[PDB]
Design a binder for this molecule. Structure first.
Ligand SMILES: Nc1nc2c(ncn2[C@@H]2O[C@H](COP(=O)(O)OP(=O)(O)OP(=O)(O)O)[C@@H](O)[C@H]2O)c(=O)[nH]1
Ligand SMILES: Nc1nc2c(ncn2[C@@H]2O[C@H](COP(=O)(O)OP(=O)(O)O)[C@@H](O)[C@H]2O)c(=O)[nH]1
Ligand SMILES: [Mg+2]
Lengths: 445, 451
């Protein structure tokens, strides 16, 4: 009944997307013909959530591909599962975005985005109950940033009550891959903040460190780094496709992760994560899953959650699980870690358990934690953004596509407002707030 | 699709284009008469390089190149050389008289007699680009046609194709080596005309590349064929993302969006590495860190100013072949952490990184290093303001005495042209000084207490 569309945008977001769709094709036993030859009733009987059904025993993935540069799009076509992707779900420019969010918003994306909206519609009249929208993209990209926030802000006017959810590559704290990152990220966050429902922050500085520390990978490749992402998007959607003791679908998830409509940026995590050495020795249990889920170096953001307080947490456990053993581990953390939860949201946990583990793991858990700690991202990016717009640096390229200086001011005004809202609630009292004045004593006349 | 078009302007541009267009055939298997010697899809397929060639006949390649100097002697060497049967015969273009190492002969007389024949053949190449990116010009600032025709081509292109990527690739003035008595004038009449047009312009000096060949490659005898056959790998490392697949590829637009804080400050200085002798390549370790170290080394820079005399604004550091994104992140984090390797106070974000899977490939006909991986770097920095100060020195001694100016007069040029180009150099000097400053705030005058 209930079915999800995914979009993939940017050279970044399609390279993630193409491999998400492999990992998923594996979970469902899809052969690179687009044919089911898997190994359980359920895999085929909940294939609907993700693929269109087609005659002659074929499934077509309900995913769209978008980039204004033709390069990587053809790399996806002649690679792995590239032939299962629908040719008419590839929508590509000629020029690129040039790393430029305003070339994506105003030029080469306006010129192309209706032709996509039409395919998004043709997908939406394929969904009996349209769940909503997943995106993979990059905030430091051009097209993922600029033509994705074009698409995000246009969907919302056309699809008002559906969820619109995002898995963004986000700028990292030590290095940078593109110079206009703070402009692209901050112009992005301006649109995202008021046209989306979830914002999963994914960071390569953490992904590179998880690959090096926890998996003892001497040389982490992007092959490696997308895998973790795919197995987490997997995680986050496991409760539509696969049954268990508690099902937490994308609606139910979001309700328990967003306390006010702008505080919707998260630190996801995956568990377990173990080298080929480690796998021999660590027991794969509900308490070692929970401990790895809260482990402050194992989150998918290069920002330390122990710098703030959890508003809210969610977990998606996968496989043969025992309900008291889950709940009490969720309780043991909240007891030994009282300092890491916000005090006026009580009992900060959303549990949920699936019967069915990820292919090639005997049991796993997914973390989606919502902390104040994300203040760090918006703190760094808005100073780097004032570092740029204060001196009109890099800005001629974007004004040069029809943007105005008012807009840089409004993207900034909002991010500064936003970091002030997360810092208003960083360590906000359970004790009353303000207006501390009173009535006096009766006086002789 | 993603098409680029090169223009090889004057004797240096031409001598360079013969090096470049050996390697642009050689990377794909394409032979010296345009032939694909074995083709898995005759009439389609991969062939990822229709970005650099148009196909004809039974899968013969025609390149997307143009050659022009007003000297037959340097173009006939294309039409009688080793590659004569590759190129297109109306793309080996001449003129009736060469430009004497002078500007005005280009811009107002004899280049102005050939510009409309050239712009027309360029229009026929351009209409056959389904996804025209833009165009590159290859020159010397010190050249005669180099100065006199680039200027007149980019006065034409930038309002013929406009928003299309406008690029230059320039031999940039040597500190102590010289070729001609008239180089300072040729350089400065072109910056005046053409810096209003290029979105990014990429820079190298022969005095550094002679150093690279004598030190790094350990060559006793750099011919210009030894020199230019290094430069091939610079544009091969820039152009890879359009010619092969990978992991993080960079279009001809993105260099602009990332290298350029300001649209006068778009002249980044190249370097490329590793560069070793055929003795050194067997004792080196040649990991991504050790390449990236040698890439910021001052001696190793392909324009001969020490970057330490400057401060870095921005940079682009693309990787090719056997390279890993975490390993690259590690070398960026290392040069970043050494803050002694100096950026401007204001810099929030200074970098542009790329991954292409196809390796470095050399030429036939040397004792050469067949490395597994390489970097190609461009540095934007106030260190170019040391070599502007040299053009400020050279110019004023000649121009005050009014030495040579009558040779420019007599072939179509205003006196006010020299003056107004050096005026622009008086601006550029300061355009580069208003950046090298630290971001601290305040104005006017005070002498008393607030406290
Ligand atoms: N790197 C390099 N620089 C070259 C080469 N040939 C000459 N030069 C440089 O380019 C300039 C010389 O070119 P010119 O002789 O002026 O050639 P032109 O531009 O065609 O001028 P005319 O021939 O008078 O039309 C000087 O600044 C030289 O240092 C070459 O093949 N490699
Ligand atoms: N994690 C991840 N990031 C990638 C990958 N490839 C590219 N990126 C990142 O995405 C950005 C590149 O932007 P790009 O996609 O080229 O721009 P766009 O095509 O205009 O949307 C940089 O931050 C890269 O590190 C990948 O497969 N995985
Ligand atoms: Mg000449």
């Amino acid at each position: 009944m209930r079915e999800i569309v995914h979009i993939q945008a940017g050279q970044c977001g399609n390279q993630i997307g193409a491999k998400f769709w492999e990992v998923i094709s594996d979970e469902h036993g899809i052969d690179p013909t687009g044919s089911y030859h898997g190994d359980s009733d359920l895999q085929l009987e909940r294939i609907n959530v993700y693929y269109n059904e087609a005659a002659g025993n074929k499934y077509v993935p309900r995913a769209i591909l978008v980039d204004l540069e033709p390069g990587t799009m053809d790399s996806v076509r002649s690679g792995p599962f590239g032939q299962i992707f629908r040719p008419d779900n590839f929508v590509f420019g000629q020029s690129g975005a040039g790393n430029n969010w305003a070339k994506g918003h105003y030029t080469e994306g306006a010129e192309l985005v209706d032709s996509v909206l039409d395919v998004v519609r043709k997908e939406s009249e394929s969904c009996d109950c349209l769940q909503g929208f997943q995106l993979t993209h990059s905030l430091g990209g051009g097209t993922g940033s600029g033509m994705g926030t074009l698409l995000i802000s246009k969907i919302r006017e056309e699809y008002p009550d559906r969820i619109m959810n995002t898995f963004s590559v986000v700028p990292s704290p030590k290095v940078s891959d593109t110079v206009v990152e703070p402009y692209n990220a901050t112009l992005s966050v301006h649109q995202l903040v008021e046209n989306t429902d979830e914002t999963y922050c994914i960071d390569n500085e953490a992904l590179y460190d998880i690959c090096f520390r926890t998996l003892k990978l001497t040389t982490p490749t992007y092959g490696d780094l997308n895998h973790l992402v795919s197995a987490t998007m997997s995680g986050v959607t496991t409760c539509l496709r696969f049954p268990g003791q508690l099902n937490a679908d994308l609606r139910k998830l979001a309700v328990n992760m967003v306390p006010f409509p702008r505080l919707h940026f998260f630190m996801p995590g995956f568990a377990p994560l173990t080298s080929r050495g480690s796998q021999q020795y660590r027991a794969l249990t509900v308490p070692e899953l929970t401990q790895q889920m809260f482990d402050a170096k194992n989150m998918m953001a290069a920002c330390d959650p122990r710098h703030g307080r959890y508003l809210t947490v969610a977990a998606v456990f996968r496989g043969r699980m025992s309900m008291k053993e889950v709940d009490e581990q969720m309780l043991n953390v909240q007891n030994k870690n009282s300092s890491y939860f916000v005090e006026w949201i009580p009992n900060n946990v959303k549990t949920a358990v699936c019967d069915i583990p990820p292919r090639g793991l005997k049991m796993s858990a997914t973390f989606i934690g919502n902390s104040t700690a994300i203040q760090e991202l918006f703190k760094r990016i808005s100073e780097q953004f004032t570092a740029m717009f204060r001196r009109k640096a890099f800005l001629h390229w974007y004004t040069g596509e029809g943007m105005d200086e008012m807009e840089f001011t409004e993207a900034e005004s909002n991010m500064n407002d936003l970091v002030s809202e997360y810092q208003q609630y960083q360590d906000a009292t359970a004790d009353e707030q303000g207006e501390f004045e009173e009535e006096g004593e009766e006086d002789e006349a | 699709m993603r098409e680029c078009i090169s223009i090889h302007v004057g004797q240096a541009g031409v001598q360079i284009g013969n090096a470049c267009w050996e390697l642009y055939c050689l990377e794909h298997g394409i032979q010296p008469d345009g032939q694909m010697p074995s083709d898995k899809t005759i009439g389609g397929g991969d062939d990822s390089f229709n970005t650099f060639f148009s196909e004809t006949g039974a899968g013969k390649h025609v390149p997307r190149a143009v050659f022009v100097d007003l000297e037959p002697t340097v173009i006939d060497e294309v039409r009688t050389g080793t590659y004569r049967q590759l190129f297109h015969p109306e793309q080996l273009i001449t003129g009736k008289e060469d430009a004497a190492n002078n500007y005005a002969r280009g811009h107002y007389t004899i280049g102005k007699e050939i510009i409309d024949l050239v712009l027309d053949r360029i229009r026929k190449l351009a209409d056959q680009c389904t996804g025209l990116q833009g165009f590159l010009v290859f020159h010397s600032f010190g050249g005669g046609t180099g100065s006199g025709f680039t200027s007149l081509l980019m006065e034409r292109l930038s309002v013929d194709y406009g928003k299309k990527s406008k690029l230059e690739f320039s031999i940039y003035p040597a500190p102590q080596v010289s070729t001609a008595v008239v180089e300072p004038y040729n350089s400065i009449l072109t910056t005046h005309t053409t810096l209003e047009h290029s979105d990014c312009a990429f820079m190298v000096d022969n005095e550094a590349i002679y150093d690279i060949c004598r030190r790094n490659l350990d060559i006793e005898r750099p011919t210009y064929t030894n020199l230019n056959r290094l430069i091939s790998q610079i544009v091969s490392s820039i152009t890879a993302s359009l010619r092969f697949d990978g992991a993080l590829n960079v279009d001809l637009t993105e260099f602009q969006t990332n290298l350029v804080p300001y649209p006068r400050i778009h002249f980044p200085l190249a370097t490329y590495a590793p560069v070793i002798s055929a003795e050194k390549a067997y004792h080196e370790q040649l990991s991504v860190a050790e390449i990236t170290n040698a890439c910021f080394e001052p001696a190793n820079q392909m324009v001969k100013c020490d970057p330490r005399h400057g401060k870095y604004m921005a940079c682009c550091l693309l990787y090719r072949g056997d390279v890993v994104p975490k390993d690259v992140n590690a070398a960026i984090a290392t040069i970043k952490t050494k803050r002694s390797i100096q950026f401007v106070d204001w810099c929030p974000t200074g970098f542009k990184v790329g991954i292409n899977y196809q390796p470095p490939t050399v030429v036939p006909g040397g004792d050469l290093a067949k490395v597994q991986r390489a970097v190609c770097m461009l540095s934007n920095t106030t260190a170019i303001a040391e070599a502007w100060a040299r053009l400020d020195h050279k110019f004023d001694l000649m121009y005050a005495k009014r030495a040579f100016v009558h040779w420019y007069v007599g072939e179509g040029m205003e006196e006010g042209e020299f003056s107004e180009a050096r005026e622009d150099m008086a601006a550029l000097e300061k355009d580069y000084e208003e950046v090298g400053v630290d971001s601290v705030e305040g104005e006017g005058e005070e002498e008393g207490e607030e406290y």
